[PDB]
Design a protein around this ligand. Sequence first.
Ligand code: FAD
Ligand code: XYL
Ligand code: CL
Length: 414
Amino acid sequence: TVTNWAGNITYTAKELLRPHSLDALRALVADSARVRVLGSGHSFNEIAEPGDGGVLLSLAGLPSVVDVDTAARTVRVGGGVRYAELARVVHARGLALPNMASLPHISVAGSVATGTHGSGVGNGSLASVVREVELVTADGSTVVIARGDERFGGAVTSLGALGVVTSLTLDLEPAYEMEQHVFTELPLAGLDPATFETVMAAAYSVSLFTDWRAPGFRQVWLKRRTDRPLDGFPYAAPAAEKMHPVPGMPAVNCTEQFGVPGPWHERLPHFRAEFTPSSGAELQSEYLMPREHALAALHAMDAIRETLAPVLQTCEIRTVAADAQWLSPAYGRDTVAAHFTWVEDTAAVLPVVRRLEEALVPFAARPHWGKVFTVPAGELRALYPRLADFGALAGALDPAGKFTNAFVRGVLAG
Ligand SMILES: *Cc1cc2c(cc1C)nc1c(=O)[nH]c(=O)nc-1n2C[C@H](O)[C@H](O)[C@H](O)COP(=O)(O)OP(=O)(O)OC[C@H]1O[C@@H](n2cnc3c(N)ncnc32)[C@H](O)[C@@H]1O
Ligand SMILES: OC[C@@H](O)[C@H](O)[C@@H](O)CO
Ligand SMILES: [Cl-]
């Protein structure tokens, strides 16, 4: 029996395949009628489900390649490699990524497939650093698509619906140091658009957290580059203690605070690489909207906070720079993201998700493809200007829909 990380999704397991060579992988794909790839299982819905008849394919049995070209400042990484390993290797060569997700133990291919991002107003999504993807397509042939190709905008954030991504090449920068400064009790009252932008721009990456109980925000996390200036932060009080994003959880699990300098890859995530949970008692949703709607969205959430709070562990507010990828929730517009880590109870949570989606409809809110959402397919298709172009690319590379399951079919058709 195969489950996702949160344990709310159990897959229909005809067979799980774990090839040990590319030769074996190509033959298995060509010989199978329906395939979905399983990454690290950090999605919260049926996106990785093959359905009956279909095969679930993992890259865990392949050599986990991490090939840093220091001259070119690039790294070539296998489809199943996770960020924690990637980051350690690139750091040891004196290089770095521009951003990371909250927890590093997640597959690179699976991360970019759904629109994974961190925070920072000038920082693009995790997909934005990819310069090339290598795909094993439905007939077992390899197709390489790189920045500049007409098809590239559909090739990185692809919901795994084009084929098996066996390697990706990423752009790198020189290694840098960071400090993390946490603050408590930022009011929502009197926050204007200018002060909101000032707060979110106050360091390289900034997150707000709240429990939607007492008015305002519980915490502000500033992740600052030591090679950039830090101005006084008058808007909230400095934390007296080490904090966890989720009130009442162990702060030992989190990356170092109190402004202590350390390497990028030990400061961008919220959770220490030593923290290796094999499952989590949580559900997640996130909605990504035009940045200009930030204050209006925050006030809509505040007005229904009594509905949100009872089923909420924590809510995180972030920013993302406009993305070139057609299916990125951050496609074509500078973005504000509102993330919800819920309690595990699906029956209690879904009615609240529906209400939240009702409150965010005037703000063109796109849900994160890897998280829980109930936005109807027709509505969903309308939120993505280039969704049609992705549909044509899938039909071209996979005309029999080998890599389409119920989730992808519903999205495209559906
Ligand atoms: C669990 C979790 C999730 C998470 C997070 C922290 C935790 C503990 N922090 C996030 C953050 O800070 N920002 C963000 O935007 N998202 C964050 N998430 C979500 C997570 O990154 C995503 O849901 C991500 O897609 C999970 O990837 P993973 O690889 O674990 O998931 P999967 O269900 O098995 O696969 C997801 C999709 O990708 C396709 N896939 C995977 N590998 C391939 C390859 N090699 N080739 C083609 N497609 C691939 C799957 O088929 C599926 O569609
Ligand atoms: O996108 C997921 C979020 O970043 C969570 O990890 C919160 O930080 C805490 O639940
Ligand atoms: Cl307030």
